Each structure stands twice: as structure tokens, then as C-alpha cells.
Design a protein around this ligand. Structure first.
Ligand SMILES: COc1ccc(-c2c(C)nc3c(NCCNC(C)=O)cc(Cl)nn23)cc1S(=O)(=O)NCCO
Ligand SMILES: Nc1nc2c(ncn2[C@@H]2O[C@H](COP(=O)(O)OP(=O)(O)OP(O)(O)=S)[C@@H](O)[C@H]2O)c(=O)[nH]1
Lengths: 167, 465
């Protein structure tokens, strides 16, 4: 276990932070859900550029005062539900969030989740990626249900982090 | 994964979808199903349009929001669909309003076509006799043919089409009541798709009696400008300008399912759902059954007893036409007995039962059902060959067979009714335990020996008068 990366999951309640974590970390999904009370913890290790990184993932909530866990995190997945525009709208307030309670030099991925709900899409991929590169966020769309881009999501942010090699 | 497991199984149908959609409090599920609607066949989902639209109105926003996308999608690809949506949206709210206005926003021709039909009916109110009403109608219908063909269709038609002509001379008013309903014949040219095809060109125009349906088409067709085209077909609707049809629709759905249930199982009961079109909570149209007339008027024109009429019209007890008619009699009776029983249909009389040319009976006035507050008269038993008769015994056998069948698919029926009760001001839901009483009437707990006895008891009740 060469390294230890602390990563947080943030987003509005219901967008799928908690199911993203269970897919990525234990390859499990559930339609039925329990609101996350405070924080939930799960962990998984990967290799990038020949190196073993164990990642520690914190599943927070939309119980507003979870802000504490943000500190000392190298990466944060900020998640919105592609099918509920309101959840995408608060992403501006969610990036305002990290710019109040979290490292100003933290790796963020914007994540559109529930890409399987093709017919209910309320946030166009173009509009999102536009805000993505309008800002300093990396971007991807996932489905926790079918598992699309779920590995990709993690592997992107973990690769991005290791790219912080200090000389 | 255990839930999603089911939803991804073959077991998943539009029926089930709605149930979970109706019951589940998990918004992730509601939203999941909202999406899955698109994969189902338009036809299957269509049957449940009143439910979906009802829920949209009366349920949590979460529930609505999952449904809306699909609706709009269908609305965008079918104005028929659009129409039917719009009409239902309106009838069932007196949330909804927001969506109706959006849909109507194009459909003006049809809405004026429909307004006019309704308007016609309201005028006949000043004419106190059936016959007087009839004459105003025919005249005023003649006025319709102006704008002869137009971008309007009968939603109640099994198919897509354009209305070209109204053979006004053939139309009739059905009773002498204040806001009497009225029957009309309509000429149409069939489409492959309504939404994409030019309205046909006018063809310049230049007698009504009691006759079978195929004979009336001949007469109307031969007289019609458009009658030469292969494209030409004749439709019919009853227009009720002042009668609520939401119960009428509900019974339809219930009838239609039961019809399926007995078809799926192999129970040769017979029933006939007649299509319903809700226009307002006030008003509607009905697609009428052809080649059939009320028993009561069948007894006033024949001067016969029911059995005798059978004998006159089909033949002696040794004829095929009769035994066939007798079987169809018996089967339509058991069917309609069960329907009356399950739905607790009341106000049952020979004015509300039709007889078709093949021998089936057909019940019609589905006011007085369920919580709102069938007769085996000896005249009926006679047609069956009498109480000791084999054909009568078979009637008892069909009722049990169909009751047993009914239990095996109870939830699909109850679903239909139970969803509809939502936020409902229908008189049939007046009770506290409307749905609960309905389920009890399925006797899910009973053994078949108990049910045999219950069927026997049922028949006995129907005879007392
Ligand atoms: C109570 O609701 C109804 C239910 C069914 C029918 C109906 C159907 C499906 N088919 C027919 C029908 N057959 C006509 C077919 N044409 C032919 C034989 O050529 C005649 C009549 Cl009166 N009604 N009817 C009519 C009414 S009603 O509103 O007009 N009341 C009715 C109270 O009387
Ligand atoms: N179609 C589809 N539904 C999803 C997806 N992800 C989650 N859902 C649904 O979101 C709902 C709950 O999401 P969940 O991830 O547990 O909460 P959260 O996003 O972490 O937020 P919280 O309530 O705990 S504070 C579940 O019903 C779940 O099935 C997805 O990727 N596709």
C-alpha cells in the first residue's frame, strides 16, 4: 500500500453519492435507499503508473454539518443527478462549498450520475462539460445502476492526483 | 439488487410498473420506472393512461415528475394521444392545470369539432319530446358537413382516420330526458398516420330506419359522396353532453381486464366493454355496440317473452341458430353476472341490458357501483331451458370457472380501481372502505367447495327479485 488518498463524495441528497460508493467499492447497487446520516466510509486500492494507492472514500450527506470531513482530502467527487436539474444547479453552490471548507488545491470531478435514465435527462452533457471547462473541474457521466464509467470516475481522479508529483 | 432484479425480469410488465410506481415511496424507483415506460409497447401502457394522469394530478411531485417525460413524449408524437391526455387532465381536477395548458399549446379544429357536438346536444334540452329532439339534431348535423372534411377524428375509433361526412339523416336521439344522449353515424377516411397526412378534398353532396349494422353501412355508403373510396369507413358514437363518464371509463377498464383474465385462463364467459371517451367531468362520447337493442324495447316491439323472441329470431330448440344463441346467452349472463357482482353494479333492468343478433346480452348503465348506493328473472332462466336444464347448470359452472379465474388475477383488477380512487370525488368512492369491500368480494380466503356454495347462494339471490 504505497499511498493513502482521502477522497470525499459530495452532492445534493438523492443524487447517488452513496450508490456510487457501493458500486465502486463493493460492486453493489440498490434501488431502495437509506439517506446517509453524516458520513459513510469505504475503501479500495488501485495501481497508477506502476504504483499502489489505497483510497479512503467518505460518503457525506445533503445533517448539513458534515463539513468537518472535507479537511485534508486530496480529491472530491462532486455529484449531481443528470435527471434532476435542481441537483445540477446547486453544483455552483457545491463548488462554493469546497471553496469555503476545503483545500483550495483539491482535485474535483464533476459527475453526472444516472446516465441510464436516458429518457429523463434534464442536464445536457454539453451544458455540463461547458461549465466543467469554464471552471477547473474534470467531468464524466456515470450510472451506478449499470456501472458505466464508475471505474473510469475513480481512476480518472486517482490518476489526476498522482500527477501531483513534487520535485 | 433484489428489487432491480425483479424490474429487469420478464415478470416486469406495465401493470407491475404502475403498482410500484403507485406504492413505492422511494424516489429513485419512481424515477427508474418513469424511464422504463418508454420501453413498453404504446398499446400496453395506453390502457393505464387514466391512472398515470390521475396520479400525476393527485400524488407527490416526485411521482408526477417521473411520469411527465413519457407523457410529453407520447403527446409529441400523437395529437390523438395529446387530446386524450388533455381531456383526462381536465376531467379529473375539480398541478393538473399546468400540464393541460401546455399540451393544448394546433388542436383547435378538433376542439371546435368536439365543442360543437357538445353544443348541439345542449340545445336539444328545450325540446321536450324524443322525436322533436331528433329533428333538430338531423338539421343541425347537416350544418356540420360544412367544413365538410377537417383536421378532426374520433378518438374512440380503433384507428387513425379523418372525419369527412356526417350522414345526418341517420342520426337519432335515444331518450326524452332533459339532457338526452344521442347517437350518430360518422364517415371517415382511414389513415396510416393522422399526424402526417393532408386533409382530404370535399366531395359535393346532393332515409333512416331500423336495420342491422351491415345494412346501414350499405345504405349510408351508397348515398355518400365519398362512399366509392376504398379508404372509406363508417364510425359511430353516442354523445353525452351532460353525463359523467369517469365511472363509465373505470368500469370499462375493469371490464376490459376481466375480459383478458378470462381469455388468459380458459373460461368461456362473454362480455363486451364499450369504449369510453372522457371530454369533461360533465361530458363524453361512447362507441356503441352495433346490432343490439334494449330488452325492454325488444319486449315492446316484439310483444314477446324473451325466450319466445329467441325462438322467433333464431329458430326452434332443434335449430343451430338457437342453441348457438342460447350458449351465447348463457355465457354473456355468467360474465355479466360476475361483473355485476364484483363491481356491485346496481340499477339493473331491461332498459340497461342489450341483446345482440347472436344472442349475447350486454349491460350498459354503470352508475350505482361499488360503494355507491344483477337479477336472474325466470324470463331469463327460461331462455336457458329452465332450472333443471343442463344449459342452466353450465351457467353455474361458468360463473364458478370465471370466479376462480378472477381470483388468480385479482390484483390487476383491484389495481385499476384502487389507483382511481385517488383524491376522487366520484360517488362510488364515497365509503371509507370502498376498495377494502371490493377485495373481500373476491373471497381470496375461500376453498372451492366454499365457492361452489357461494355461487349457488349468488344465483339464489338473483331469483328472489
Ligand atoms: C348509460 O350509458 C350507455 C351505455 C351504452 C350505450 C350503448 C352501446 C355501447 N351501444 C348502444 C346501442 N346500440 C346502437 C347500435 N346501432 C345499430 C343497432 O345499428 C343503443 C343504445 Cl340506446 N345504447 N348503446 C348507451 C348508453 S346511454 O348513455 O345512451 N344511455 C342509454 C339509455 O337508454
Ligand atoms: N436510474 C438510476 N437510479 C439511481 C442511480 N443512483 C442512485 N439511484 C438512486 O438514488 C437513490 C438514492 O441514492 P443514494 O446514492 O443512496 O443517496 P445519495 O445520492 O448518496 O444522497 P443521500 O440521500 O445518501 S444524502 C436510489 O433509489 C438509488 O436507486 C443511477 O445511477 N441510475
Amino acid at each position: 500500500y504505497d499511498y493513502l488518498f482521502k477522497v470525499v463524495l459530495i452532492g445534493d441528497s438523492g443524487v447517488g453519492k452513496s450508490n456510487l460508493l457501493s458500486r465502486f467499492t463493493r460492486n453493489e447497487f440498490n434501488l431502495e435507499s437509506k439517506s446517509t446520516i453524516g458520513v459513510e466510509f469505504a475503501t479500495r486500492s488501485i495501481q497508477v503508473d506502476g504504483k499502489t494507492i489505497k483510497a479512503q472514500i467518505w460518503d457525506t450527506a445533503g445533517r448539513a454539518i458534515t463539513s468537518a470531513y472535507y479537511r485534508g482530502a486530496v480529491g472530491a467527487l462532486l455529484v449531481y443527478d443528470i435527471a434532476k436539474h435542481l441537483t445540477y444547479e446547486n453544483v455552483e453552490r457545491w463548488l462554493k462549498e469546497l471553496r469555503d471548507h476545503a483545500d483550495s488545491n483539491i482535485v474535483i470531478m464533476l459527475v453526472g450520475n444516472k446516465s441510464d435514465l436516458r429518457h429523463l435527462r434534464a442536464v445536457p452533457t454539453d451544458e455540463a462539460r461547458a461549465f466543467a471547462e469554464k471552471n477547473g473541474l474534470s467531468f464524466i457521466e456515470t450510472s451506478a445502476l449499470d456501472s458505466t464509467n464508475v471505474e473510469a470516475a475513480f481512476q480518472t481522479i486517482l490518476t489526476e492526483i498522482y500527477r501531483i508529483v513534487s520535485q | 439488487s433484489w428489487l432491480l432484479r425483479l424490474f429487469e425480469s420478464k415478470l416486469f410488465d406495465i401493470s407491475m410498473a404502475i403498482s410500484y410506481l403507485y406504492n413505492s415511496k422511494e424516489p429513485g424507483v419512481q424515477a427508474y420506472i418513469g424511464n422504463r415506460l418508454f420501453c413498453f409497447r404504446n398499446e400496453d401502457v395506453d390502457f393505464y393512461l387514466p391512472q398515470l394522469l390521475n396520479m400525476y394530478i393527485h400524488m407527490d411531485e416526485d411521482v408526477g415528475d417521473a411520469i411527465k417525460p413519457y407523457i410529453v413524449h407520447r403527446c409529441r408524437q400523437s395529437i390523438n394521444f395529446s387530446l386524450q391526455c388533455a381531456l383526462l387532465l381536465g376531467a379529473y381536477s375539480s398541478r393538473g392545470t399546468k400540464l393541460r395548458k401546455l399540451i393544448l399549446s394546433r388542436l383547435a379544429p378538433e376542439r371546435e369539432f368536439i365543442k360543437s357536438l357538445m353544443a348541439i346536444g345542449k340545445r336539444l334540452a328545450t325540446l321536450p319530446t324524443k322525436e322533436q329532439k331528433t329533428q333538430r339534431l338531423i338539421s343541425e348535423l347537416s350544418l356540420l358537413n360544412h367544413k365538410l372534411p377537417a383536421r378532426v377524428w374520433l378518438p374512440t375509433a380503433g384507428f387513425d382516420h379523418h372525419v369527412v361526412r356526417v350522414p345526418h339523416t341517420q342520426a337519432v336521439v335515444l331518450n326524452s330526458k332533459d339532457k338526452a344522449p344521442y347517437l350518430i353515424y360518422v364517415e371517415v377516411l382511414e389513415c396510416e398516420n393522422f399526424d402526417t397526412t393532408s386533409v382530404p378534398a370535399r366531395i359535393p353532396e346532393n332515409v333512416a330506419l331500423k336495420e342491422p349494422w351491415q345494412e346501414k353501412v350499405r345504405r349510408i355508403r351508397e348515398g355518400s359522396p365519398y362512399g366509392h373510396l376504398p379508404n372509406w369507413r363508417l364510425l359511430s358514437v353516442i354523445v353525452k353532453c351532460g353525463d359523467d363518464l369517469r365511472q363509465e371509463l373505470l368500469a370499462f377498464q375493469v371490464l376490459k381486464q376481466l375480459q383478458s383474465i378470462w381469455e388468459q385462463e380458459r373460461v368461456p364467459l362473454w362480455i363486451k366493454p364499450y369504449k369510453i371517451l372522457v371530454i369533461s367531468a360533465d361530458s363524453g362520447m361512447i362507441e356503441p355496440v352495433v346490432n343490439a337493442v334494449s330488452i325492454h324495447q325488444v319486449k315492446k316491439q316484439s310483444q314477446l317473452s324473451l325466450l319466445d323472441y329467441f325462438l322467433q329470431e333464431h329458430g326452434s330448440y332443434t335449430t343451430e341458430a338457437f342453441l348457438s344463441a342460447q350458449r351465447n346467452f348463457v355465457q354473456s349472463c355468467a360474465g355479466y353476472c360476475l361483473v355485476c357482482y364484483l363491481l356491485q353494479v346496481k340499477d339493473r333492468h331491461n332498459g340497461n341490458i342489450l341483446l345482440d343478433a347472436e344472442g349475447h346480452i350486454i349491460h350498459i348503465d354503470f352508475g350505482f357501483i361499488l360503494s355507491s348506493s344483477f337479477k336472474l328473472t325466470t324470463e331469463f332462466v327460461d331462455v336457458m331451458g329452465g332450472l333443471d336444464g343442463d344449459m342452466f347448470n353450465y351457467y353455474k359452472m361458468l360463473m364458478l370457472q370465471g370466479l376462480i379465474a378472477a381470483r388468480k388475477h385479482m390484483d390487476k383488477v383491484v389495481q385499476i380501481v384502487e389507483i382511481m380512487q385517488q383524491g376522487s370525488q366520484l360517488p362510488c368512492f364515497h365509503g371509507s372502505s370502498t376498495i377494502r369491500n371490493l377485495k373481500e368480494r373476491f373471497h381470496m380466503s375461500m376453498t372451492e367447495e366454499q365457492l361452489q356454495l357461494l355461487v349457488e347462494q349468488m344465483v339464489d339471490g338473483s331469483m328472489r327479485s
